Amino acid sequence: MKKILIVDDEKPISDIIKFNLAKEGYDTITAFDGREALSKYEEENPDLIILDLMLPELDGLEVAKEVRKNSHVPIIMLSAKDSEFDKVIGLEIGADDYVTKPFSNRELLARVKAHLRRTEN
Amino acid sequence: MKKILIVDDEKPISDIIKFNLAKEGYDTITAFDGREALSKYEEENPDLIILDLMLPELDGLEVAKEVRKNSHVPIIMLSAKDSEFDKVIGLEIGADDYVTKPFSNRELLARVKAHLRRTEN
């Protein structure tokens, strides 16, 4: 199975993503801070990271940069900041996608599927 | 350089995307209906397709379906339909991204870069 790393500080959001991804047959691991995200990414090799922008310790931009030091694993950024600026900055840093909260669970699921399917190709 | 196929029946929209992509160093080719899109996609081999959903002759889902028979070339779908349903359908058929109209040009550009950058990896 494909393993999704879900990093978000707010546990109710993380549980909804985890539950929906589990329904679809994904393995899921969670991190609730930027530092925890980076250690979980190195130790467990997720196939995709869902990455909140506002995290403890290290924010999502910083996490994304460290990941991109070493890998091309797809990154879908989540953000309450729905500015045009923030979306461009996330993508240029190395996000493969940028989704604002509130978001649709099905849309995120299909975005997860779409980016995992590219990795195959 | 990279070649972007821009398929939108509405020439003002197409011109703004052509202009912004050309400014960023991209080569650009255009189509204005689904049939013309498929012939240009076949004969000119774009590195990325920006694909309007509301097309005459055949709509963007059909274009995407046809293209996907033979290539994994990235497709960024554009749509005035801002519904969760239409976003998921486009992604499931094989769109790599789905962006609603009206859109930010820097954001679309950033998404163009992000999906071309994935192909290079």
Automatic annotation (TrEMBL), chains A, B:
Its main location: cytoplasm. The chain holds residues 1 to 121 of 235 of the full protein. The lineage of its organism: Bacteria, Bacillati, Bacillota, Bacilli, Lactobacillales. The keyword Phosphoprotein applies. GO terms for biological process: negative regulation of DNA-templated transcription. The modification 4-aspartylphosphate is found at D52. It is found in: Cytoplasm. Member of the two-component regulatory system WalK/WalR that regulates genes involved in cell wall metabolism. Binds to the promoter region of the transcription factor fabT gene in the fabTH-acp operon in vitro. Inhibits transcription of fabT, probably acting in an unphosphorylated form, thereby playing a role in the regulation of fatty acid biosynthesis. Essential for normal growth in vitro. Required for maintaining normal cellular morphology, acting, at least in part, by regulating peptidoglycan hydrolase pcsB. GO terms for molecular function: DNA-binding transcription repressor activity; phosphorelay response regulator activity; transcription cis-regulatory region binding. Monomer. Homodimer. The gene is covR. This is Transcriptional regulatory protein WalR. Keywords: Cytoplasm, DNA-binding, Phosphoprotein, Transcription, Transcription regulation, Two-component regulatory system. GO terms for cellular component: cytosol; protein-DNA complex.
